[PDB]
UniProtKB/Swiss-Prot annotation:
Transmembrane segments: none
Record-given protein name: Alpha-inhibin-92
Phenotypic consequence of residue 12 to T: Less common genetic variant
Per-repeat ranges for Sequence: 3-40
Length: 40
């Protein structure tokens, strides 16, 4: 369930193509492994 899009600069590819509807650009907002939506 991990996304790999670090070298994508000309083939323009987004984190496991899910945005707008899914908005998979937030990654739950888990501050590292154990974080939550607190986000201090």
């Amino acid at each position: 369930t991990y996304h790999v899009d670090a070298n994508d600069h000309d083939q323009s590819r987004k984190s496991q193509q899910y945005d707008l509807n899914a908005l998979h650009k937030t990654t739950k907002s888990q501050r590292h492994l154990g974080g939550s939506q607190q986000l201090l």
